[PDB]
Design a protein around this ligand. Sequence first.
Ligand code: CDM
Ligand code: ADP
Ligand code: MG
Length: 282
Amino acid sequence: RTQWPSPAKLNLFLYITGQRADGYHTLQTLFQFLDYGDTISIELRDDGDIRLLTPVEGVEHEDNLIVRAARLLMKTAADSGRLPTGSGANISIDKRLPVGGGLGGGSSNAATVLVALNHLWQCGLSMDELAEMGLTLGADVPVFVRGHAAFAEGVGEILTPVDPPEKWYLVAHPGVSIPTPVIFKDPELPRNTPKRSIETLLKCEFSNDCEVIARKRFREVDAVLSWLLEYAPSRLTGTGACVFAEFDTESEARQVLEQAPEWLNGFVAKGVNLSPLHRAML
Ligand SMILES: C[C@](O)(CO)[C@H](O)COP(=O)(O)OP(=O)(O)OC[C@H]1O[C@@H](n2ccc(N)nc2=O)[C@H](O)[C@@H]1O
Ligand SMILES: Nc1ncnc2c1ncn2[C@@H]1O[C@H](COP(=O)(O)OP(=O)(O)O)[C@@H](O)[C@H]1O
Ligand SMILES: [Mg+2]
């Protein structure tokens, strides 16, 4: 049996620059990982099956991104003779990231399964191939597949590795579930933010174009943001509902957490420019 990290990510900033006709939004964002997330364990099968043994709450087996990732890799490899006969796996996950919470846990789960099973089945697919397969599963899957903090354009797949400061974060989950489509279809969502350079973006104040909508429509996001902004710079990540505050040291971040009311649903973790997954792969 093998164990594989599946880390969370933050959008240190997130700007919506436009929208293409397929419905998706063009953006400029800065991904960083957290040294914190799910653990996925794999045991190879020889009967060619794929079984997710640990269900994820509210997700059907065949709807689970873990299974979809594994089956997508199995089909691609077999279509091109890269799948040893009988390849399969029993997969289990210890999920720490709230489902749909905003940290991209499902996105990260798919990436880890692609990278791990590519290694275990000895499919030999390249990073570009894996990341290309990941993109069909989710716009956030490629960053996790490629394993480094990155400036992202396109829908999230045009990735330029960068090395942001690995600050400490208090990550809080408001008590509400924000479906990603709700934010992205909101008429008031900024979709005209001017496309700028990484040097302009690295100097300008970091913000999240989705925040004004999240905080306005979901009072529990506004409550959590208001509490944290009294202590440190705080922003929405992804489309929410998750919110994080930035700190320079573990002690400060943990002191604010010790004070935080339970409805923050908070934890503290350090940013990591190298994905714990790719770190464990070395
Ligand atoms: C907002 C971010 O979290 C920033 O990292 C990502 O761009 C979202 O990507 P994601 O979590 O993988 O969500 P997906 O499963 O890929 O897409 C869900 C839906 O969100 C909307 N969506 C997502 C990404 C994007 N660049 N433009 C969009 O309009 C689409 O309606 C899509 O049907
Ligand atoms: N392994 C998984 N973990 C979490 N969610 C999953 C998984 N597989 C499928 N999903 C589904 O996809 C969504 C999870 O999105 P996720 O990336 O966790 O959201 P966010 O990016 O807001 O954190 C939910 O609709 C859930 O039903
Ligand atoms: Mg997502």
